[PDB]
Amino acid sequence: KYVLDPVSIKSVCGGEESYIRCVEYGKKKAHYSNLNLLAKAILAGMFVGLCAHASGIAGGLFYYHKLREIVGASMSVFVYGFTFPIAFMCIICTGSDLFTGNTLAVTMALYEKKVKLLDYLRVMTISLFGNYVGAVSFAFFVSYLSGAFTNVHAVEKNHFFQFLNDIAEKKVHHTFVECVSLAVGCNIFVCLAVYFVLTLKDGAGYVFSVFFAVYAFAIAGYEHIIANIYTLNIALMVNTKITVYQAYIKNLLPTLLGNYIAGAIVLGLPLYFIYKEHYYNFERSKR
Amino acid sequence: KYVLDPVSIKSVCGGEESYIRCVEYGKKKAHYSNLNLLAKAILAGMFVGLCAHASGIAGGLFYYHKLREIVGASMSVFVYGFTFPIAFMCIICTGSDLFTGNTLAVTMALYEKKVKLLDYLRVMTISLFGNYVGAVSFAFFVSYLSGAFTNVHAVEKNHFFQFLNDIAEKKVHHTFVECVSLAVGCNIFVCLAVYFVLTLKDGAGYVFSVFFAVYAFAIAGYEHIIANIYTLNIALMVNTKITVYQAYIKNLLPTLLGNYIAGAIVLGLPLYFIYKEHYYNFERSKR
Amino acid sequence: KYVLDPVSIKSVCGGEESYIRCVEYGKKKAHYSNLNLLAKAILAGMFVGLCAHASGIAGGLFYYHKLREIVGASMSVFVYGFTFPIAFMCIICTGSDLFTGNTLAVTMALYEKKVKLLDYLRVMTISLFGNYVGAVSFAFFVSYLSGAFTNVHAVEKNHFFQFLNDIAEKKVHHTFVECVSLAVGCNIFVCLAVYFVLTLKDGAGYVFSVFFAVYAFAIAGYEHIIANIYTLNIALMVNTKITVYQAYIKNLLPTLLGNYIAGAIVLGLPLYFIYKEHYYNFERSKR
Amino acid sequence: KYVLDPVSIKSVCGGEESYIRCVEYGKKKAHYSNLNLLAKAILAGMFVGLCAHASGIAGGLFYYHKLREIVGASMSVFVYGFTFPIAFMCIICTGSDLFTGNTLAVTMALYEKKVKLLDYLRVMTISLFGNYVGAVSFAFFVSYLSGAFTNVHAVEKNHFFQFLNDIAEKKVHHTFVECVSLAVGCNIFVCLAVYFVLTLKDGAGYVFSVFFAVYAFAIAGYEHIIANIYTLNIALMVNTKITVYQAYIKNLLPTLLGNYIAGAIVLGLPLYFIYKEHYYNFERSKR
Amino acid sequence: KYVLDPVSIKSVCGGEESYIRCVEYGKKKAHYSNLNLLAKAILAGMFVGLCAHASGIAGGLFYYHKLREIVGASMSVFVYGFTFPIAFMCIICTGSDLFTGNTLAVTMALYEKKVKLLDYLRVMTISLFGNYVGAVSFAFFVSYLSGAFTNVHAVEKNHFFQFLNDIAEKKVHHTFVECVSLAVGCNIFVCLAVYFVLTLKDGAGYVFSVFFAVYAFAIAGYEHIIANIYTLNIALMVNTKITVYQAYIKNLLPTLLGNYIAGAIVLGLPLYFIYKEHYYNFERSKR
């Protein structure tokens, strides 16, 4: 028995089905309990801190002072962006929730009258607080207590502290509008990575679409709020040149504002206007 | 219970089914409303601008003045072509429409008498105008307002402005025939990437065929009209050496002409001549 | 409802089914009309010329005269072999026919008495002529008219012409037996890539098996007849050091002979001897 | 017959199904016999030693003394982390058991009252002892007896011994708390790789999620107990600078403690609290 | 009609099903005729010689004498290990048999009383003889007759002969025990690659698991018998420094012994002890 023509399959979907999957995905976050959503948010912040520690070590390896004289910071940022995107896979495969992914899906479910307003504010507040707690807890209990980014004062050995110092100094010197624009550019990639998870339902579609999307903002200098919550706090712990006013007012608040703008307004509102009749049809065809 | 021989499946199709899928894909664009097609075109131009900003930063990192003395512009163009092809995935997974993808599919549906002539002109005009608006809006609101490509006048720090300046000077110095030929070579790759999306219906077939096809024209110096609409306008915004006559007459019009020629004539007309009887059989077997 | 054990599937086949698929694939080429087969051959030659232009630009970028002093021609040939293999995906996904792929499949169908002798000669002649016409048409209308490989006489800028000149001089200096042996080594990889397309019926199996198989012959210095038809003609157009006698007698005829030998004799005849009883059963089980 | 819309499939699962699959996976380890579990543990330790020997040779190639002066140890650690993650695939595809993977799954089955306490201690003890025996047996019978890491005393040839010496000296100079923190960071990645195997049920989902997860801790300097059992014992065999007290007390005991903490407490207990009602529903729907 | 939850599939199997598939795979080799098995073995040796010629050229490109002064032999061995693993795909997709793959599967079928003893000796002898004939035939008719590894005596051009000379001198200087240990380490990877083909039944699972497994022994300096049969014979043909006693007694003999030991004893006997009751149940459930 020989098979000449096998069964034709497909592991992808259209734009209408991707919109309906995203609205149904954001609708489920409002039905968890408070402690369940809080534990998932703390786990997601911990995963972000884990892979950002790994990326900082991998980028400070290529920030060696003799290699830095020839290539600058190019290979450091490339190996950082290569090492980082597994955090999103760790978040998705355990079912954890990130705030920047929720800014598209839960807001889309708010637009479609699937989530109430107080439930929306409750979900977003609990998700942001849990992501902060998880990222700062990983920055203290693993990153600070292992001594990986300690200032060791010798230029042939200090290339991990110096990479953390220069990265934390670069992202704390923007003006308000520049940090808001870079955060908008970040969260468009992050929400599109969530959309890729909802669309391409196989292993390579999970791994490599999210890999290219997260590498693309990690190498562009775009500003993610949870990765900055990890990075600026570990940079404050190991005593880099930044201060706490520079960390929280000059980076974290414009990053939060731009990340919310890119998910709720730039991406969610045109896609709602495009596919709201398809969501209306899907729902009517359930009676 | 042990499975010795599983069920034989297949996530690919033949050339006849790919042609029928492309004609049916281009036939659907003439049935959207004007505002729906306009919003999808604006979103596609925004995605092109997003990943071209990311690619310009990733290429200007490797354009550091000490690395540039050894390797020239080789690693800059390679990392640009590595970072760019996720834009096409962002366009496909949200259901947005690009003009260069439409030049094959909607013209094929025009040849098969599925789209009328005024509907064809309406769809192409709305798609080109929306792609222009989205790309220039991203070039101003994110790329210009973040200060990423500002001339900072110091050779150890000016490697983002200098990469943008040299790229925008290289693609503005062609003659008419050279720019038309490079645009033809670009849009053959872009229309083949659309054909790859219609053929390989899984996650790796979406990601990596489009990756190799878009990297191949990004490293070849081929001319894409929407990427040039982004790049020459951000190069005019940050005050590179090019002028607006050089940007619009010496690059953009021959790129539009060559991109339309490669989709409507070079690729669409032989494929129509090859597979029009298979499309006739597909239609005849629906009565 | 939770899925603990999903449905076991398989997107691969055995050697007997791959042989039967290859004989049935080569049997279909003798049933097209002459103009249909001619148009598919012209499209395949055009795709080969397209991705060879892209690979020549990508390899001449890394052939910069300061990088060439350190690494030689290693990174140029690696980036050429990285950029090239998407040509075969273009050929496969549109349904075009290449001569070197046909030398295995149509000859296997000739051995199994599925194609007559005059139909075999007609199919091979039309395929070779159309591939030549498509490759020389792309070499003139895109590669020559864009000025990408023009001798610009300055050593810091002439690294595209110099890469084309040195590649075209390297592959024109072989003796007859050396060029025949390198062509045999090429067409074994090309016919195995066709066999990979017939065996692995998913997107990653299409992309990456063909990628590794075509990169392996592009970095080995093996001789492909259609890629040489493009390369030696564009090298004659931009006035490199080779002549037309060296291009056509010293390279193209031994490449044609070795490419036919590797498909019809080295690969097709042992596989026919191995799997002809399976093809006999497959045919006997259709009555 | 043309297929326009194929059958929609999916090779991924949700978080609840991944939890149920992990509890059912850890429940099966307590039902093997003692010799079966011991043989699987010895095979897993042998695979870890195999791919760590391969990674040590691949990293000592890039630790050449003229390349080490420019890039430091960056390319050595990158090629180590590139070469290493196939060990886990070798462990999964043969059905072998690793201790660090078991610390999540068997502890989750202990929390759900599926494994008794003495069965838990028996499974963990037999798994750790077999992994130790397999790793030290590969370190002697292949790594030591082949002479690959012999001190050859000449700086142009000693780059395998020097890479092993510097890696074994770096991971033996930590304090207790630093080694515990790095081991926690390691076993979060290892348990998430086990979770990726249970979630993404296709070939790319097996290969590349595990690749990125294991590369991410191999480049971060995180501490795996079985890889350290191989590495410190082969470093003691070829007479590096470390001692047996430094190997066993200063590295191996804090690595065991942190690896158990990250699987049983950091990852297993929140996921149990999140998904224990879904496991209760899965069991209630089997009567 | 929108698909919200598609059909859950799986392209992987467990360890018991992989063992049963391996025993049934090795049991089929004893049922071929002598000429069929001989032709498949000759084809497998030819494929090994093909991709080893390609890997030798790709590694001698990066062995350029100015690059060799900085990085040593690191990039040469990396590009060799990158280029090599497509040989295994060429062997699998045509249905050819390699001796090193057979040492696990046919010995497992011997342990399960599925193959008799004389049939076992006949299959192993015919497979080894055909692999030798195919590898030496490719080493003469393609590798030697093309002049690719000729000593050209100029240090700026002799980097293919010098890479072949130094590789053939490195692998001929081991002691008996060192070559046996390196051959054991090789054939564990080769038999695990065969196991990966039997387990992961999709295109990425075929390509990339075999890629990483074969790259891992190609960069580790592990000794494969068929690749050494090619390499030492082409090194004797182009007159390197080795002799025929060094080639056949000091390398080939211990490589054959270690490759048989790693398949029949190290890997086959524990896996037989683990899964023989599952094979008994699989057979008992066929009556």
Residue numbers in the entry:
A (entry chain D), B (entry chain C), C (entry chain B), D (entry chain E), E (entry chain A): 7 to 293
List passages from the publication reporting this PDB structure.
After glucose is broken down into lactic acid by glycolysis inside the parasite, the end products, including lactate and protons, are extruded to the extraparasite milieu by PfFNT. The 5 protomers of PfFNT resemble as a pentagon-like homopentamer, with a width of approximately 80 Å and height of approximately 70 Å, with a 5-fold axis that is perpendicular to the membrane plane. Similar to the reported prokaryotic homologs, each protomer of PfFNT, comprising 6 transmembrane (TM) segments, presents a typical 3+3 invert repeat that is conserved throughout FNT family members.
Using C5 symmetry, we solved the structure of PfFNT to a final resolution of 2.3 Å. Although 250 mM sodium lactate was incubated with PfFNT before grid preparation, no extra density for lactate was found, which might be attributed to the low affinity between lactate and PfFNT. These 2 residues coordinate with each other through a hydrogen bond in the apo form PfFNT. Although the NTL is unstructured, 5 NTLs of each protomer orderly tangle to each other. We captured an occluded apo form and an inward-open inhibitor-bound state.
